């Protein structure tokens, strides 16, 4: 035979993967990678973030100084983990705007407390209760000071505490709501008391409401917790005629990246930057389906449980070229040559075109994988109580956010996959045209991805075509003689 | 040395449509479809959602038990429709945080009420008023209990009601603000009263303010409405020495997909999943411009009133010529096809396979644009009757931010999709041309206008063999090479 | 000698610019434009928006009528600019909902005040203080009326003011908190006063708290500011037994595009639609990095400090064609021809293909640049105090928004640049194919972007190829003779 065949082709695999594009919902590619993190280890890694396990204590109980929370005194955290088993074991209390106090302490990230010498002359300090046992002693919240009558007298208190420092001061104080009038008059001589806590710019007044309350841990009395922030150069001024649960000092309030999370996941010895209530998750992938509640450098939450990014070309199950099919038998390259000549048949991968496609697919992998982590503060996203307007707005904000990011994730994968298909198809065409330019007038396109070479073309000659060193002039006379005969 | 011409082309229409792409603001295509729902029937369909027309009653008036709202007792709804003509015809009242009470009742979706036996020994029950007529006699809110003196005595009430069930209880109660001291002392012996309603985790104390308020429906007194939710295992405790408007029981409070909408649109007999204050709208399209207030499975609201998605190729208005120059208005039975000119005359034939390939891809993207579409969650309020400050600004800002982002998404999506449709329909034309040139081998030359000069005798059957893909170039190669390569 | 060479090419520049695409993080193009506004002039332009410089006055002090703010009476604004140097110099006061009042007045855009004749029979009007000097005399807030005892009597007030107009009325009023019981009884006979301000649909009751507050400008007393909006057809009813700081009328409350901004930037005589606290910025570009706080028609805020949009093709620094190289020596076009023939060598730009590429790039420039400005009202985005739940939600919404727009901006530039690279490559190939179709059998593709023309091809013949009027039949006999020799 005075001719040879040179076919251009691409590889194929027996186990393709379905992905989505702009055109079709399901197209098979040779390989893909998952972009949605859907699994967790189940453990909260104690590195690199400072994790603080609240165990039996809520953050507020550790703030007030519930006795079984004494170990939390002056503690700091990057992430405070509140357990569902936590409980209160001191004086029954409520906190108006509980969520806001819990949030502002959590964000501050410290329970550092500085005692201050308040001048409570005329009243008895450190009132206790059998409902707040600390060891063998009736006691009280470690950071609050229960004031009451001294010598059957409760003089009007007018006590000041200036902030001469360079930091903000967080003062926690309260008001005692006795259950009976006798109880009211025994502790505070008057049948009713008043508290005004003021600064240069603010004032807070609260009236105790004597009366029976539903029984909670052996009492029908209550304490209401309030807070006051005193800026540097401002002054705390306390006026009371009874029922004041006084502060023993202030908490340092700092600005930082700390937060709080509800979780029953065990704390483990490992390292992971992203934390969810289900446990830590890796943050290599750009999206995650584990939990919309996150802490740290985290993939963005989406509704999809899987989004596959194509990392290879379309998978397509005498000799023939790429127009017909792909080559499962080609394992050492993505594109290559098959030939038939006087020496038989052969196959060789084209490394340069293979690397050009691989470099682009790895290129888009870096862009899709590095424009990734959400890294700012998080509102609450789960609610135990029905609250109306503001809770509705929080849910609406989070739902709007998730739908937009789910849309972004869906579009990104479809656009990226369409481009991956296009670029891998383009490399095939570029190799074919490159080969056709080499052959000049010595070959004809058979239309199936193969060239009919109109001269004797041994393996070294075929190698020169794969080489880019084929000299068409050497064979032109023979080839034109074979092509243009009658 | 006879020859023939075979031209490749695509169709064109006289009435094209302008669409947008990544490049141009206006490019004419053969066909397009609208993606923004911009019209409504004006009618609220009563299916498949349970619609409840409030008619003359607000949701709160039906909750409290205004006499002309008695027909709303124990009713449920998926969507409560409040009319602008609604009015109150009972005791003048106000509700601190009205919007929150209205919202949580609306979301619960039921006015189911369970009477309970409270112990009001020592006081007179069921106080009435002439401004709240029921039938012929002075009456009051059906679900509220006006307590006052018994035998010139109002003992300190200390009444309990445990929650021993497995669901939450919503208690509606109130406080009477008399206009004069005589009124205060006649009904409630002391010159001032107190109310404390508490649970294990909450307590609410409110002080009546005796005095005249502006005249409303014949009275200068007021009732202030409050509410309390009691969890299972918790206990309601009521302590009062006067002015208490007592509850007669609790409302069931549920968690579900119910809501409330202000609208004057009539309710109709039809079926439609998306409801807006303008009426029901179809939800086939991905976007809508009718109203940012929606209920049900609805297209997403965008600022654009039209977004046209290309569903055909670019529209482009004696020898024959191919696709390079123009399109073929005379081709009606296909999108791509052939024209030939040979010894037997001229002819035209559509290529069915390549036409379907284009249509299949365009229908493919039509599905993707339409299937990832409906918003399916709860909606905050988006219109406001009073100017309120911080929280209302944030609600408006959230909604404005959302709409701008979805408007951007819709604009980009249509421009990308249209660019791809133009590109794929152009590609099908080029692939059909390349497919033909591969068949002809050395028997033809590209004339540069979308046509081939075939350098051999090429009768109608021979032309048909090229369109059919069965043309054998070897049969004609000798004749063709002789015609091509002469001096 | 009896042949010619015709090469197809595109231009190149020595100083390319790096942009991003879908594939690579850094690809050099001939030209690009910046999409992120990152600089400000430092000046707030007084046009075309009505700027009102508060100078020494906060908006609230101008509202109440602090004497050194008398010049702001009845003033209007599009944007009120509050300075950090502002101060109060009247009676010490607080506003329980300061931020909300400041916001609704700012949004209304006017301090227009309508005096009304209230019936204060039985009390003395226009109470003053030495802490609020107007000229040289004890005075008070210009818009408030300090009522107190007349003839050692303070009768119970029951005063009405109906709204019979067609607009809403904003009433600003207050309550006096005396520091001692002596002040309380001297001004108001009773040891305590009560105020109820009501309408058909609302009622507000407030109790003074007698007692010492921290020293502010020589006094320990306070005024608490409250407000009431009265709709058309509604009625204001004021009931007082002491301590009432009465309104002298109402402020007009309008609905419009006005707002308030904190800034120390100087106000300028210039024109700029977009204002930031750093100063006015141009709004030609679609995005900006200057400040998330904006007023007017503004580019959207993004985290990126630069986003470069390609406005030219990839930059690729005898004769050869585009397969190898770009042509830095081609300055008058984007694509063109280089030839070698019997009359010498030459270069010519192809205007049609250059304009086709430029028109597509200018076309996408309009779409990227014209659909751009945010044109609605803005929440607060910086906070002086630590506040809890609602502030967290405000921060979270703004952070969510900025990340979404930052993502949109990144994806848009990557897609646009990929398409710009692709469309400019396509124009080069289309020009090459157009030339190849013209030449028919008279030339062969040399594989480097050049044609070998197998006939004598003078300057006029080359011109006919570039003009699209080359007649291949004229030269086909000569060309076939040179090509097909054996
Ligand atoms: C329910 O709430 C009311 C309101 O706080 C509570 O009222 C208190 O009732 C006691 C009697 O039970 C009053 O004490 C009496 O005052 C007179 C005044 O002279 C005195 O002579 C009597 O010996 C007795 O001390 C008390 O003043 C009153 N407190 C207020 C603020 O009005 C009531 O106790 C609550 N009941 C329950 C069961 O919670
Ligand atoms: C006003 O009404 C409430 C409603 O009952 C009264 O509260 C009740 O007070 C008694 C004790 O005074 C509580 O009984 C306790 O029950 C536990 C359960 O085992 C038991 O261990 C204690 O030894 C004691 O028996 C009862 O729980 C409590 N009810 C609620 C709902 O908390 C209140 O005392 C009345 N106050 C008056 C009349 O002043
Ligand atoms: C404005 O609101 C005030 C605050 O409630 C109302 O004050 C009430 O005024 C009446 C007399 O004007 C007081 O009643 C009198 O009490 C004395 C006490 O010795 C008695 O001797 C008289 O026979 C008469 O009953 C009433 O106590 C007082 N309310 C309170 C809580 O102190 C006033 O009525 C309102 N004015 C309006 C709406 O015009
Ligand atoms: C405190 O002042 C208010 C208002 O200055 C007094 O309320 C007024 O009471 C009169 C008495 O009926 C109301 O008269 C009504 O006039 C309309 C006119 O159309 C008429 O249709 C009614 O049948 C009735 O006669 C008047 O509307 C009402 N004003 C308001 C704003 O509600 C109040 O009586 C004073 N309180 C004391 C204790 O003096
Ligand atoms: C502004 O408020 C004052 C006080 O609330 C109103 O003045 C009061 O007007 C009534 C009727 O004009 C007076 O009643 C008269 O009392 C005299 C005895 O002094 C009696 O001889 C008459 O037959 C009549 O009953 C009332 O005394 C008077 N009170 C005061 C303190 O002057 C005044 O009408 C209000 N202004 C307007 C425009 O409504
Ligand atoms: C702290 O705040 C309380 C109220 O929030 C202020 O209470 C007031 O205390 C004075 C005593 O300095 C009381 O005045 C006295 O009343 C007796 C009894 O009639 C009288 O005989 C005396 O001549 C003297 O006037 C005043 O009633 C009381 N206020 C109230 C509303 O009851 C206290 O002054 C504040 N202390 C400081 C240092 O700011
Ligand atoms: C309740 O306690 C407060 C806080 O200790 C007392 O306020 C203080 O009152 C004194 C008396 O005038 C103020 O002294 C003044 O200081 C200024 C600033 O240098 C000075 O220029 C004056 O000549 C005068 O000496 C002091 O500033 C003030 N402190 C605060 C924080 O307000 C108040 O006196 C007590 N209440 C009663 C009724 O005594
Ligand atoms: C399928 O594609 C993935 C992603 O490109 C390949 O996984 C990468 O493999 C290289 C070298 O083996 C690593 O350096 C990358 O970190 C891997 N990336 C990811 C996301 O895993 C994988 O090798 C391909 N072939 C398969 C899975 O058979
Ligand atoms: C991670 O944990 C959360 C809750 O801690 C899981 O969310 C619940 O999933 C169950 C699965 O049946 C649902 O029934 C609940 O309605 C979900 N609750 C909430 C509040 O979302 C979540 O499924 C976990 N992630 C997993 C298992 O991948
Ligand atoms: C809604 O309320 C209006 C106002 O009361 C009702 O219209 C009145 O209806 C009664 C009874 O038919 C007539 O006697 C009155 O003459 C009507 N007045 C006016 C001004 O129209 C209306 O019927 C109510 N409709 C419903 C469904 O409750
Ligand atoms: C549906 O009704 C709404 C109002 O319920 C219309 O929206 C308002 O229409 C008026 C009339 O032009 C405008 O002045 C308002 O500015 C519109 N408000 C908003 C938020 O858009 C809306 O145009 C109606 N749609 C149809 C199709 O009738
Ligand atoms: C690089 O591209 C920019 C943008 O296309 C060119 O700047 C434009 O120049 C025209 C004509 O002078 C102006 O009408 C446009 O307003 C300009 N646009 C922008 C965004 O500045 C610039 O000339 C190009 N540079 C080179 C060297 O070609
Ligand atoms: C803003 O207020 C400050 C402080 O009152 C002013 O500074 C005073 O300026 C005037 C002349 O400009 C002098 O009479 C005073 O001696 C300055 N210092 C003081 C009073 O401590 C400033 O001028 C005011 N600026 C404006 C624009 O009103
Ligand atoms: C515009 O002004 C803001 C604040 O006045 C600048 O942001 C601050 O920049 C400094 C560095 O100069 C940082 O230390 C602060 O932390 C920044 N604060 C905030 C809130 O961002 C901003 O850089 C200015 N931008 C321009 C273009 O002038
Ligand atoms: C197919 O199987 C091989 C080994 O059997 C594996 O390496 C490859 O990842 C698989 N392909 C895909 C797309 O998972
Ligand atoms: C938590 O409380 C339970 C029940 O009182 C107790 O058995 C357990 O030891 C506590 N754990 C810690 C860490 O305090
Ligand atoms: C505390 O205040 C009293 C005034 O009641 C004062 O006499 C005393 O010096 C102050 N300091 C003390 C007791 O250390
Ligand atoms: C291919 O090229 C190499 C050098 O690039 C040469 O050594 C070899 O002989 C050529 N022919 C083949 C490999 O058939
Ligand atoms: C235009 O497109 C729509 C939707 O793709 C299709 O239903 C309709 O039949 C098309 N019309 C023509 C004339 O092609
Ligand atoms: C209601 O409460 C009163 C309180 O004095 C009590 O005497 C009476 O027995 C109670 N009635 C019933 C039916 O339980
Ligand atoms: C294709 O169609 C033409 C016309 O009917 C005919 O000449 C030819 O043999 C057909 N070949 C097929 C269907 O394989
Ligand atoms: C096109 O330009 C060539 C350059 O020489 C010229 O020969 C020819 O006449 C021109 N034709 C037209 C139509 O401009």
Tab-separated table of N, CA and C in Angstrom, chain A residues 118-183:
chain	number	residue	atom	x	y	z
A	118	UNK	N	-17.766	49.871	95.743
A	118	UNK	CA	-18.932	50.722	95.877
A	118	UNK	C	-19.174	51.011	97.348
A	119	UNK	N	-19.657	52.217	97.619
A	119	UNK	CA	-19.895	52.674	98.984
A	119	UNK	C	-21.366	52.423	99.302
A	120	UNK	N	-21.642	51.268	99.897
A	120	UNK	CA	-22.998	50.896	100.303
A	120	UNK	C	-23.219	51.111	101.796
A	121	UNK	N	-22.805	52.256	102.328
A	121	UNK	CA	-23.026	52.531	103.743
A	121	UNK	C	-24.510	52.741	104.010
A	122	UNK	N	-25.014	52.079	105.042
A	122	UNK	CA	-26.406	52.166	105.431
A	122	UNK	C	-27.225	50.944	105.093
A	123	UNK	N	-26.688	50.007	104.311
A	123	UNK	CA	-27.419	48.806	103.938
A	123	UNK	C	-26.557	47.582	104.200
A	124	UNK	N	-27.222	46.439	104.336
A	124	UNK	CA	-26.528	45.165	104.448
A	124	UNK	C	-26.227	44.628	103.051
A	125	UNK	N	-25.008	44.135	102.859
A	125	UNK	CA	-24.554	43.614	101.580
A	125	UNK	C	-24.626	42.090	101.532
A	126	UNK	N	-24.514	41.562	100.308
A	126	UNK	CA	-24.287	40.131	100.047
A	126	UNK	C	-25.407	39.242	100.592
A	127	UNK	N	-26.650	39.663	100.376
A	127	UNK	CA	-27.764	38.805	100.730
A	127	UNK	C	-27.722	37.513	99.931
A	128	UNK	N	-28.124	36.421	100.578
A	128	UNK	CA	-28.069	35.110	99.978
A	128	UNK	C	-29.421	34.420	99.990
A	129	UNK	N	-29.411	33.186	99.498
A	129	UNK	CA	-30.622	32.389	99.409
A	129	UNK	C	-30.244	30.921	99.415
A	130	UNK	N	-31.145	30.096	99.950
A	130	UNK	CA	-30.911	28.659	99.951
A	130	UNK	C	-31.095	28.075	98.557
A	131	UNK	N	-31.743	28.813	97.650
A	131	UNK	CA	-31.872	28.384	96.263
A	131	UNK	C	-30.592	28.604	95.469
A	132	UNK	N	-29.596	29.293	96.044
A	132	UNK	CA	-28.321	29.554	95.369
A	132	UNK	C	-27.178	29.065	96.281
A	133	UNK	N	-27.063	27.746	96.415
A	133	UNK	CA	-26.032	27.159	97.265
A	133	UNK	C	-24.677	27.239	96.578
A	134	UNK	N	-23.674	27.691	97.318
A	134	UNK	CA	-22.286	27.615	96.882
A	134	UNK	C	-21.555	26.842	97.974
A	135	UNK	N	-21.368	25.549	97.741
A	135	UNK	CA	-20.782	24.664	98.722
A	135	UNK	C	-21.730	24.298	99.844
A	136	UNK	N	-21.423	24.795	101.036
A	136	UNK	CA	-22.202	24.533	102.236
A	136	UNK	C	-22.923	25.795	102.690
A	137	UNK	N	-22.886	26.835	101.867
A	137	UNK	CA	-23.349	28.160	102.220
A	137	UNK	C	-24.483	28.603	101.314
A	138	UNK	N	-25.513	29.193	101.915
A	138	UNK	CA	-26.422	30.034	101.157
A	138	UNK	C	-25.600	31.124	100.492
A	139	UNK	N	-25.887	31.400	99.229
A	139	UNK	CA	-25.037	32.337	98.519
A	139	UNK	C	-25.876	33.056	97.471
A	140	UNK	N	-25.210	33.565	96.447
A	140	UNK	CA	-25.858	34.411	95.464
A	140	UNK	C	-24.937	34.490	94.256
A	141	UNK	N	-25.438	35.122	93.199
A	141	UNK	CA	-24.638	35.350	92.007
A	141	UNK	C	-23.338	36.051	92.370
A	142	UNK	N	-22.220	35.456	91.944
A	142	UNK	CA	-20.914	35.938	92.386
A	142	UNK	C	-20.667	37.387	91.984
A	143	UNK	N	-21.262	37.840	90.882
A	143	UNK	CA	-21.010	39.172	90.352
A	143	UNK	C	-22.084	40.188	90.719
A	144	UNK	N	-23.097	39.788	91.483
A	144	UNK	CA	-24.168	40.677	91.907
A	144	UNK	C	-24.116	40.802	93.418
A	145	UNK	N	-24.630	41.919	93.927
A	145	UNK	CA	-24.561	42.227	95.354
A	145	UNK	C	-25.968	42.544	95.831
A	146	UNK	N	-26.578	41.623	96.566
A	146	UNK	CA	-27.944	41.807	97.043
A	146	UNK	C	-27.936	42.714	98.274
A	147	UNK	N	-28.372	43.960	98.106
A	147	UNK	CA	-28.428	44.914	99.205
A	147	UNK	C	-29.795	44.887	99.877
A	148	UNK	N	-29.803	45.092	101.189
A	148	UNK	CA	-31.065	45.160	101.908
A	148	UNK	C	-30.843	45.929	103.204
A	149	UNK	N	-31.893	45.996	104.024
A	149	UNK	CA	-31.920	46.917	105.154
A	149	UNK	C	-30.816	46.612	106.158
A	150	UNK	N	-30.337	47.670	106.804
A	150	UNK	CA	-29.427	47.570	107.935
A	150	UNK	C	-30.049	48.285	109.125
A	151	UNK	N	-30.220	47.551	110.222
A	151	UNK	CA	-30.776	48.099	111.459
A	151	UNK	C	-32.176	48.663	111.243
A	152	UNK	N	-33.003	47.922	110.508
A	152	UNK	CA	-34.370	48.336	110.223
A	152	UNK	C	-34.402	49.690	109.520
A	153	UNK	N	-33.393	49.964	108.688
A	153	UNK	CA	-33.324	51.186	107.890
A	153	UNK	C	-32.763	50.866	106.508
A	154	UNK	N	-33.346	51.484	105.483
A	154	UNK	CA	-32.825	51.430	104.118
A	154	UNK	C	-32.727	52.865	103.622
A	155	UNK	N	-31.623	53.546	103.908
A	155	UNK	CA	-31.474	54.925	103.442
A	155	UNK	C	-31.383	54.977	101.930
A	156	UNK	N	-31.787	56.119	101.375
A	156	UNK	CA	-31.725	56.314	99.929
A	156	UNK	C	-30.266	56.299	99.497
A	157	UNK	N	-29.933	55.376	98.609
A	157	UNK	CA	-28.570	55.252	98.135
A	157	UNK	C	-28.329	56.206	96.974
A	158	UNK	N	-27.155	56.830	96.966
A	158	UNK	CA	-26.750	57.747	95.900
A	158	UNK	C	-25.250	57.534	95.698
A	159	UNK	N	-24.920	56.496	94.919
A	159	UNK	CA	-23.561	55.966	94.798
A	159	UNK	C	-23.056	56.153	93.372
A	160	UNK	N	-21.809	56.594	93.256
A	160	UNK	CA	-21.185	56.922	91.988
A	160	UNK	C	-19.981	56.025	91.744
A	161	UNK	N	-19.670	55.833	90.477
A	161	UNK	CA	-18.488	55.079	90.067
A	161	UNK	C	-18.046	55.655	88.735
A	162	UNK	N	-17.033	56.512	88.730
A	162	UNK	CA	-16.570	57.094	87.468
A	162	UNK	C	-15.726	56.121	86.660
A	163	UNK	N	-15.806	56.267	85.343
A	163	UNK	CA	-14.953	55.526	84.421
A	163	UNK	C	-13.819	56.454	84.000
A	164	UNK	N	-12.666	56.313	84.647
A	164	UNK	CA	-11.494	57.114	84.327
A	164	UNK	C	-10.505	56.362	83.451
A	165	UNK	N	-10.867	55.160	83.003
A	165	UNK	CA	-10.000	54.335	82.192
A	165	UNK	C	-10.084	54.660	80.714
A	166	UNK	N	-9.524	53.755	79.912
A	166	UNK	CA	-9.498	53.891	78.460
A	166	UNK	C	-10.376	52.862	77.762
A	167	UNK	N	-11.216	52.146	78.505
A	167	UNK	CA	-12.069	51.108	77.949
A	167	UNK	C	-13.508	51.289	78.412
A	168	UNK	N	-14.421	50.659	77.677
A	168	UNK	CA	-15.819	50.629	78.066
A	168	UNK	C	-16.015	49.659	79.222
A	169	UNK	N	-17.001	49.957	80.063
A	169	UNK	CA	-17.345	49.127	81.206
A	169	UNK	C	-18.756	48.595	81.015
A	170	UNK	N	-18.926	47.291	81.194
A	170	UNK	CA	-20.237	46.661	81.162
A	170	UNK	C	-20.652	46.355	82.596
A	171	UNK	N	-21.705	47.024	83.070
A	171	UNK	CA	-22.236	46.805	84.410
A	171	UNK	C	-23.498	45.966	84.331
A	172	UNK	N	-23.532	44.879	85.093
A	172	UNK	CA	-24.710	44.033	85.218
A	172	UNK	C	-25.301	44.275	86.599
A	173	UNK	N	-26.588	44.601	86.646
A	173	UNK	CA	-27.279	44.862	87.901
A	173	UNK	C	-28.690	44.320	87.756
A	174	UNK	N	-29.478	44.442	88.814
A	174	UNK	CA	-30.763	43.782	88.785
A	174	UNK	C	-31.727	44.417	89.755
A	175	UNK	N	-32.938	43.881	89.768
A	175	UNK	CA	-33.955	44.328	90.704
A	175	UNK	C	-34.691	43.130	91.273
A	176	UNK	N	-34.903	43.149	92.582
A	176	UNK	CA	-35.567	42.063	93.286
A	176	UNK	C	-37.071	42.308	93.290
A	177	UNK	N	-37.837	41.310	92.838
A	177	UNK	CA	-39.297	41.351	92.863
A	177	UNK	C	-39.774	40.418	93.962
A	178	UNK	N	-39.993	40.912	95.178
A	178	UNK	CA	-40.478	40.038	96.247
A	178	UNK	C	-41.884	39.551	95.949
A	179	UNK	N	-42.221	38.414	96.547
A	179	UNK	CA	-43.529	37.803	96.345
A	179	UNK	C	-44.606	38.340	97.291
A	180	UNK	N	-44.253	38.812	98.491
A	180	UNK	CA	-45.253	39.328	99.420
A	180	UNK	C	-44.854	40.705	99.939
A	181	UNK	N	-45.837	41.406	100.502
A	181	UNK	CA	-45.558	42.720	101.062
A	181	UNK	C	-44.691	42.630	102.314
A	182	UNK	N	-44.958	41.652	103.188
A	182	UNK	CA	-44.103	41.448	104.357
A	182	UNK	C	-42.662	41.200	103.930
A	183	UNK	N	-42.473	40.314	102.950
A	183	UNK	CA	-41.145	40.097	102.388
A	183	UNK	C	-40.559	41.408	101.881
